[PDB]
Amino acid sequence: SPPSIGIAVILVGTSDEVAIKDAHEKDDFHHLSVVPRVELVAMNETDPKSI
Amino acid sequence: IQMALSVCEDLISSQVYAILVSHPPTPNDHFTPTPVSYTAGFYRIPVL
Amino acid sequence: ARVIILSASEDDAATVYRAAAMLNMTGSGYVWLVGEREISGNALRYAPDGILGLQLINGKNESAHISDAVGVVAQAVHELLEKENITDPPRGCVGNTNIWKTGPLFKRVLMSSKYADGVTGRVEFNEDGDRKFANYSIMNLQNRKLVQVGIYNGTHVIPNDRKIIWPGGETEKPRGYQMSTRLKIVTIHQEPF
């Protein structure tokens, strides 16, 4: 109920994306009840205005 | 954030050779060269 | 020792001035010294007498600085147009993130040039990108009002004429040091000594 899991992982190199999402949901941490709502993004040639 | 966005928009629309930055008339004399120092600095352009 | 060099925020400067004035410390022979921020604003109100301070000759004239800046960038641009193998400034902050090839090169010319005549004196840049050879207006708190006494040219100090007042009257200059004739010796047990 107290999630506090507003996390986000963003990559700008598009390196090992499949392995990143595969291990993203692989282990449970019930001792730290967080409801891990995560996100993802792709490379966009990170520029000041773009970033 | 708005100043950084407008700085990027200006350098996009002006391709400046050198940008001058002033002080704000709303005290807090530390946030003046916050946006232009690192926003219009990615291309290594002189700032005054 | 007597002299007390200070540098802090003006809001904190008022509090430390009040704390110093609480004790019988500011006066007699305890000559102070401060910068420029902690001498203006509210900090001047709680400051005591006998405060020697600092002040730039030209720090608020925006128009003169603008004119000098535009002149120096114009002269640098005119000096660097004769170069070769140059690129145009990048177009776009939205979909482009690179480094201008001619960016750093400009540095090697913009801080290595002379402005010659200027309304704010000569314009020269140290090897950091900062202004050097400034003129400071030495200042003294006389009768609860600021008054100029002495000025700086950048290299040597120039006392104007009017007499500065050290804290608590006593127009004679204090020595700035004393001697504590109450030293505490130490020993250790020994038979014959």
UniProtKB/Swiss-Prot annotation, chain A:
Coiled coil: none annotated. It is found in: Cell membrane; Postsynaptic cell membrane; Cell projection, Dendrite; Late endosome. Glycans are attached at N44. Phosphorylated on tyrosine residues. Primarily found in the fronto-parieto-temporal cortex and hippocampus pyramidal cells, lower expression in the basal ganglia. The extracellular N-terminal domain (NTD) endows NMDARs with a unique capacity for allosteric modulation, harboring several binding sites for small molecule ligands that act as subunit-specific allosteric modulators of ion channel activity. Heterotetramer. Forms heterotetrameric channels composed of two GluN1/zeta subunits (GRIN1), and two identical GluN2/epsilon subunits (GRIN2A, GRIN2B, GRIN2C or GRIN2D) or GluN3 subunits (GRIN3A or GRIN3B) (in vitro). Can also form heterotetrameric channels that contain at least two GluN1 subunits and at least two different GluN2 subunits (or a combination of one GluN2 and one GluN3 subunits) (in vitro). In vivo, the subunit composition may depend on the expression levels of the different subunits. Found in a complex with GRIN1 and GRIN3B. Found in a complex with GRIN1, GRIN3A and PPP2CB. Belongs to the glutamate-gated ion channel (TC 1.A.10.1) family. NR2B/GRIN2B subfamily. It is linked to Intellectual developmental disorder, autosomal dominant 6, with or without seizures: A disorder characterized by significantly below average general intellectual functioning associated with impairments in adaptive behavior and manifested during the developmental period. MRD6 additional features may include seizures, hypotonia, abnormal movements, such as dystonia, and autistic features. This is Glutamate receptor ionotropic, NMDA 2B. The lineage of its organism: Eukaryota, Metazoa, Chordata, Craniata, Vertebrata. The chain holds residues 31 to 81 of 1484 of the full protein.
Swiss-Prot record, chain B:
It comes from the Eukaryota. It is found in: Cell membrane; Postsynaptic cell membrane; Postsynaptic density membrane; Synaptic cell membrane. Coiled coil: none annotated. NMDA is probably regulated by C-terminal phosphorylation of an isoform of GRIN1 by PKC. Its phosphorylated state is influenced by the formation of the NMDAR-PPP2CB complex and the NMDAR channel activity. Component of N-methyl-D-aspartate (NMDA) receptors (NMDARs) that function as heterotetrameric, ligand-gated cation channels with high calcium permeability and voltage-dependent block by Mg(2+). NMDARs participate in synaptic plasticity for learning and memory formation by contributing to the long-term potentiation (LTP). Channel activation requires binding of the neurotransmitter L-glutamate to the GluN2 subunit, glycine or D-serine binding to the GluN1 subunit, plus membrane depolarization to eliminate channel inhibition by Mg(2+). A hydrophobic region that gives rise to the prediction of a transmembrane span does not cross the membrane, but is part of a discontinuously helical region that dips into the membrane and is probably part of the pore and of the selectivity filter. The extracellular N-terminal domain (NTD) is a site of allosteric regulation to modulate overall receptor function. It is linked to Neurodevelopmental disorder with or without hyperkinetic movements and seizures, autosomal dominant: An autosomal dominant neurodevelopmental disorder characterized by severe intellectual disability and developmental delay, absent speech, muscular hypotonia, dyskinesia, and hyperkinetic movements. Cortical blindness, cerebral atrophy, and seizures are present in some patients. This is Glutamate receptor ionotropic, NMDA 1. The chain holds residues 72 to 119 of 938 of the full protein.
From Swiss-Prot, chain C:
It comes from the Eukaryota. NMDA is probably regulated by C-terminal phosphorylation of an isoform of GRIN1 by PKC. Its phosphorylated state is influenced by the formation of the NMDAR-PPP2CB complex and the NMDAR channel activity. Glycans are attached at N24, N61, N85, N135, N153. It is found in: Cell membrane; Postsynaptic cell membrane; Postsynaptic density membrane; Synaptic cell membrane. Heterotetramer; the NMDAR subunits are modular and harbor tiered domains that function in concert to regulate opening and closing of the cation-selective ion channel pore. Forms heterotetrameric channels composed of two GluN1/zeta subunits (GRIN1), and two identical GluN2/epsilon subunits (GRIN2A, GRIN2B, GRIN2C or GRIN2D) or GluN3 subunits (GRIN3A or GRIN3B) (in vitro). Can also form heterotetrameric channels that contain at least two GluN1 subunits and at least two different GluN2 subunits (or a combination of one GluN2 and one GluN3 subunits) (in vitro). Component of N-methyl-D-aspartate (NMDA) receptors (NMDARs) that function as heterotetrameric, ligand-gated cation channels with high calcium permeability and voltage-dependent block by Mg(2+). NMDARs participate in synaptic plasticity for learning and memory formation by contributing to the long-term potentiation (LTP). Channel activation requires binding of the neurotransmitter L-glutamate to the GluN2 subunit, glycine or D-serine binding to the GluN1 subunit, plus membrane depolarization to eliminate channel inhibition by Mg(2+). Belongs to the glutamate-gated ion channel (TC 1.A.10.1) family. NR1/GRIN1 subfamily. This is Glutamate receptor ionotropic, NMDA 1. The chain holds residues 216 to 408 of 938 of the full protein.
